[PDB]
Amino acid sequence: LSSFWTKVQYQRLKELNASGEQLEMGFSDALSRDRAFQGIEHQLMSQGKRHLEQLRTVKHRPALLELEEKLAKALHQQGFVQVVTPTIITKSALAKMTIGEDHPLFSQVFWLDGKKCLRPMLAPNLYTLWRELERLWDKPIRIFEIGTCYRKESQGAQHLNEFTMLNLTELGTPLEERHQRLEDMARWVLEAAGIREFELVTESSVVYGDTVDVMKGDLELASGAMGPHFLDEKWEIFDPWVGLGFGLERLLMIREGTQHVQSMARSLSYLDGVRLNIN
Amino acid sequence: LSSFWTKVQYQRLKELNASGEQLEMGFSDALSRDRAFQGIEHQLMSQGKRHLEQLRTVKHRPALLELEEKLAKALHQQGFVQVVTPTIITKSALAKMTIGEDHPLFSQVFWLDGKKCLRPMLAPNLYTLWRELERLWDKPIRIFEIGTCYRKESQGAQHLNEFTMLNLTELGTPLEERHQRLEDMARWVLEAAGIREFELVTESSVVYGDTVDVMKGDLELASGAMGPHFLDEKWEIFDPWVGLGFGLERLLMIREGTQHVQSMARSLSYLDGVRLNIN
RNA sequence: GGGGGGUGGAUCGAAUAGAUCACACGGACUCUAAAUUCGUGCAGGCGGGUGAAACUCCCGUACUCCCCGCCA
RNA sequence: GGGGGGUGGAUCGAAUAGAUCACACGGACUCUAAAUUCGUGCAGGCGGGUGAAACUCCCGUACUCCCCGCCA
Ligand SMILES: [Ca+2]
Ligand SMILES: [Ca+2]
Ligand SMILES: [Ca+2]
Ligand SMILES: [Ca+2]
Ligand SMILES: [Ca+2]
Ligand SMILES: [Ca+2]
Ligand SMILES: [Ca+2]
Ligand SMILES: [Ca+2]
Ligand SMILES: [Ca+2]
Ligand SMILES: [Ca+2]
Ligand SMILES: [Ca+2]
Ligand SMILES: [Ca+2]
Ligand SMILES: [Ca+2]
Numbered sequence: 001l002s003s004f005w006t007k008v009q010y011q012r013l014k015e016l017n018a019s020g021e022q023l024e025m026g027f028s029d030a031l032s033r034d035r036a037f038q039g040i041e042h043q044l045m046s047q048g049k050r051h052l053e054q055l056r057t058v059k060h061r062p063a064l065l066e067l068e069e070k071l072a073k074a075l076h077q078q079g080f081v082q083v084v085t086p087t088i089i090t091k092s093a094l095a096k097m098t099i100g101e102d103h104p105l106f107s108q109v110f111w112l113d114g115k116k117c118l119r120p121m122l123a124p125n126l127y128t129l130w131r132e133l134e135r136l137w138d139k140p141i142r143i144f145e146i147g148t149c150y151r152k153e154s155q156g157a158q159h160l161n162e163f164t165m166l167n168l169t170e171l172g173t174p175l176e177e178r179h180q181r182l183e184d185m186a187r188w189v190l191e192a193a194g195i196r197e198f199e200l201v202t203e204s205s206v207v208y209g210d211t212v213d214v215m216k217g218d219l220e221l222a223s224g225a226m227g228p229h230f231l232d233e234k235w236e237i238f239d240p241w242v243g244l245g246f247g248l249e250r251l252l253m254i255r256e257g258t259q260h261v262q263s264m265a266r267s268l269s270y271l272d273g274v275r276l277n278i279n
Numbered sequence: 280l281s282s283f284w285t286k287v288q289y290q291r292l293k294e295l296n297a298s299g300e301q302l303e304m305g306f307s308d309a310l311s312r313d314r315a316f317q318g319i320e321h322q323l324m325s326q327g328k329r330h331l332e333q334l335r336t337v338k339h340r341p342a343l344l345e346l347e348e349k350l351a352k353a354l355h356q357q358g359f360v361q362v363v364t365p366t367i368i369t370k371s372a373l374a375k376m377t378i379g380e381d382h383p384l385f386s387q388v389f390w391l392d393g394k395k396c397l398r399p400m401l402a403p404n405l406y407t408l409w410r411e412l413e414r415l416w417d418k419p420i421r422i423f424e425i426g427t428c429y430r431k432e433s434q435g436a437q438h439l440n441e442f443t444m445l446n447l448t449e450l451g452t453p454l455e456e457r458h459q460r461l462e463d464m465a466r467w468v469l470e471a472a473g474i475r476e477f478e479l480v481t482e483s484s485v486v487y488g489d490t491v492d493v494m495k496g497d498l499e500l501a502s503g504a505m506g507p508h509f510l511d512e513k514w515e516i517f518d519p520w521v522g523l524g525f526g527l528e529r530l531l532m533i534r535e536g537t538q539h540v541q542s543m544a545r546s547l548s549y550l551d552g553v554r555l556n557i558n
Numbered sequence: 559g560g561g562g563g564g565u566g567g568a569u570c571g572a573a574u575a576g577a578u579c580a581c582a583c584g585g586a587c588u589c590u591a592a593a594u595u596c597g598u599g600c601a602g603g604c605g606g607g608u609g610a611a612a613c614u615c616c617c618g619u620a621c622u623c624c625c626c627g628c629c630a
Numbered sequence: 631g632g633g634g635g636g637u638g639g640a641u642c643g644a645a646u647a648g649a650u651c652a653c654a655c656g657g658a659c660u661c662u663a664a665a666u667u668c669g670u671g672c673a674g675g676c677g678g679g680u681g682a683a684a685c686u687c688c689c690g691u692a693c694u695c696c697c698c699g700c701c702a
Contacts, residue, residue, distance in 0.1 A: 006570085011563060011624050034570055038579040041568065045580070049415065056416060060355040062363050069348065076339035084343055086441055086545040087366075087427060092693070108628085112389045128547045131638085132555040136328070137335060148366060148427075151628075153559070159628050162365055166630090213629080220629055236638090247630020260624080266365035268407040269623070276411040277622095279567035279581055285642085290635060290696050313642055317651035320640070324652070371621065386631095387700090400702090410566075430700080432631060438700050445702090492701075499701060515566085526702025539696080548695070556695095558639035558653050 001028040009037050014260055015275035016044040023259070045278040055272050062272045063256060063264050064164065067193065067248055068146055071166060074192035080168060081143040085125035087150075091115040093124045096234040110150050118150040122167035122245070127235035130171055139172030139239065146248070148266065157260045158219065158250060164265075169243035173226075179212075181242050182224045186214050189246060194255045195221075214246070216254055222246040282306040288316050293538060294554035295323035302538070327553040334551050341551040342531050342543050343443060346472060347425050350445060350527070353471035359421045359447060364404030366427060370394040372403045375513045387430045397429040401446035401524065406514040409450055413518065418451025425527070427545070436539045437498075437529075443545070445525040452519045457505050458489070460521045465493050465501070468523075472530045474500075493523065495533060501525045 004026035005013070013023060022040060027033035055062070072082055094117065099106050110118040119125065122145055133141060146166045155161055166189070173181050183200065190198060195216065203211035212224035227241040252264040256273060263273035270276060283305045284292060292302060301319060306312035338345065351361055371394065378385050390396045398404065401424055412420050428444040445468070452460050462479065469477055474495070482490040488508060493501035503523035511517065531543040535552060542552040549555060 008563060009569065012568070014624065016568095030570090035578080037569060042580060045567070052415065056360055057358075060359060061351070061361040064363050065351075065361060072340065072344075079336075080339060081335055082340040082344060083550065084341055084545055085547055088441065090693085104628095110391055112391075116389070125547060129550070129555075133550075135558075135639090136331065149630085150367075151630095154628055154630090156625060156628065158630080160630090162367055163630060223629065245630065250630050261630090262623085266363055268364050268404055271362060271408065271412075275623090276408075277564095277567060279414070286696095287635060288641065291640065293696065309642085313650080316641060321652060324639070369621085383700095414567090428702080430702095433700055433702095434697090435700065436697060438702080442702060502701060524702060529702060540702095541696085554695095556636095556639060 001026055003027050003030050003033055005033065005037075009033075013037075013040065013044075015269075016041070016048070016278065017258060017263060017273060017275070018044065020259065048274045048278045051272060051274055063252055064248070064266075064272075067252060067255075068164070070192055071189060071248075072146065074188060075144055075168060078188055079142055081141075083126075083129060083143050083145045084147065085122075085129070085145060087119055087147065088112060088116050089119045089124055091117060093128070094120075096127070097121075097124055097231060098234070105151075108151050108153055110152050119147075120151055121149055122147060122165055123243070124235075126167060126169055126243070127231070127237065130169075131236055134171060134237070134239065141171035142169070143171075144168035158253070160249065160261060160265050162266050164248040166246040166248060167243060168246075169241060171237075171241045172239050173242050175240050178226050178240065178242055182212055182226070182244060185242065185244050186222065186224070189244075190214070190221075190251075193246075193251050195251065212244075214244075219250065219254070221250055221254075280305045280307050282309050282312050284312070284316070292316075292319070292323070294548075295320065295327065295557070296537065296542070296552065296554070297323065298536075299538060324557045327557050330551060330553050334553075338551075342535060343527060343545075346527055346531065346534075347443070350468065350471050351423075351425060353467060354421075354423050354447060357421065357467055359423045362405070362408055362422055362424050363426070364401075364408060364424060366398050366429075367391065367395055368398045368403055370396065372407070375406075375510070376400075376403055377510060377513070387432060389429055389431055398426075399430055400428055401426060401444055402522070403514075405446060405448050405522075406510075406516070409448075409514065409516060409520075413450055413516070418518070420450040421448075423447035439528065439540060439544050441545045442540075443527040445527055446522065447525075448520060448522040450516075450518055450520045452505070452521050454519050457519055457521055461491055461503055461505070461523065464503075464521070464523050468525060469493075469500075469530075472534050474530070474533060491523070493525070498529065498533065500529050500533075 005023070010023065018040065025036070027036065059066075076082065092115065094106070094109070105120055109120055112118070126143065126145065129143065130141070133143070144167060146164065148162050149165045150162050152161060154163070168185060168189070170181060170185070186200070190196070197216055198221070199215045199217070201213045201215050203213060205211065207230075209229060210226060213220050214222035214224070222244050224242065224244040226243070227237065227239070232238070249261045249265050252258070252273075253261050256264065258264075258273060263270055268276075283303070289302065297319070306315070334341070354361065373385070373388070373396070384399055388396045388399050405422065405424060408422065409420070412422070423446060425443065425445045427441055429441060430438070431440065434440055447464055447468070449460060465477070465479065476495060478494045478496055480492045480494050482492060484490070488505055491503040491505075492499050493503065501523050503521065505522070506516065506518065506520040528540040528544045531537065531552070532540050535543065537543070537552060542549055
């Protein structure tokens, strides 16, 4: 049966949020597939309208904000201190992330001028607060931020230009309790993101100390790390720590078991994982 | 009496939340001035640490974030649908706000390159989102968004480069309630950020309509507009509507009686309105 | 940085007066009602090319989407 | 686009083992603690000029803060 989905149709069935099943569908001929298509269309373009009617009359907000609040709260309970830094950082700020004019991401930055630039991460903004907060609060110190970071090659099925990040951290963790802490941290988040299935790829080096990631089979959900760290000095940090970076959208892509990420991102083409040109 | 806080002192009193009162305060000599300063400095620099105590063990979030929520949930009651549109718009889009290479706002924006840039407002994302929902949903359509906007030359005691903006709109307002409505919204939001004495300075020209500004006498908290409006043909909008733009930062600037806005804005120099370089 | 789509519901199209499903409206099927079935309305970004004819093919341009490297 | 500030707690400073208030540690006050007093510790981004001497004045650079227009 040598006639699966057309170039277009396949591509149009993502916008509409087809199950991998329906995607991997194929037919004997064409007139049968071209007709099976519009049978789905209605079915999907229908469902869309209903997810909207909910969102219109009870939920009043995108599935993207459902998470933000659910996560912030879940963390407030672990005593984390949610913060909210600026979104523009300086050329100076970056550099401190040993990222000279020749690092793989200095080419990945949205430059506003000589020394302004949209933040590729939350790290520098937290290193910075850490400085003045360490000096002021007895440890251990737990804070976090959810915020929209930017990256300008990033556009694909799991990658966007402006994505929503949750960087959470604990400054001053007993070097023993350091992994038990990540594992914890992580758990807390998924336990509240509604994900149950996850592996914990423990990456390990010497120059790159210990890298950690939160996996669901193939997909990466978070990248974690700890201190002391080689950057720590340029940020005037002399204490053990741990941090974790989740990519929200990424996660919505699993709590909602969808295929591409742009369904529930900052968009004017969707409103709550629902392509908006439907009828 | 003729010795008022030196330049340097006057400023360092700000960061610390010098009350309006104290910021005048003249002196009968410099010695007694210089001393009452350190007197108050200690006072302020110390209530700061107290504040941060609350922050770190009760609230877990700054005063901006807790407002977004108190504010959103409030509109959720009145059946608004909060959206989350992207912060990067296009040159294309901008034009549509009858901006042009001349409009004093074509200079207010941080350009990402040839055609993209950071949203100086929320309109062209709601105007955009408007298009479809007008189709799929019955009027009225109530939707709002709270998000970071951007301005470039904007850097003063009442303005920022990055301000959190709340823009709320209604599509399909009966021409007659077009006005009554604006008040309803206004009164919804303020009574959510607990604000009483408020003045609705109605501006009006036979050219822009009745451009509205939500104000507490001297300060402006919001600026709204209504349609049908001259832009509408460019956003294919053939319908009466009202809209209102708030700067959250400014609300805190009253709610928390403060003196400037950078105290609770996106910042690495503050944190819940408490200047950070304190001991 | 690159590839590939769509022309404000979309998918075919061997350029079928385009057709098909959707989607509004009215009628009948029925007292209802759903299942129908039927009637009709609803279409093609802008420039240039080809052509008998362009929505359909080429070139450009606008927007907007899917995707590859991204590590979220 | 433009002014004015600060040098990682900060404000005076007429440049002179800076000083003053904070802050940390200890005594003591009291039993202890607070308030409080004493003791000590805690200082000056980087380049160049001037100068007997520079943290203090001048030029310049780095970072950060406040302010005018901003219409949030
Ligand atoms: Ca293209
Ligand atoms: Ca029909
Ligand atoms: Ca069409
Ligand atoms: Ca033509
Ligand atoms: Ca086609
Ligand atoms: Ca083309
Ligand atoms: Ca300056
Ligand atoms: Ca001085
Ligand atoms: Ca003591
Ligand atoms: Ca002492
Ligand atoms: Ca000092
Ligand atoms: Ca010198
Ligand atoms: Ca200077």
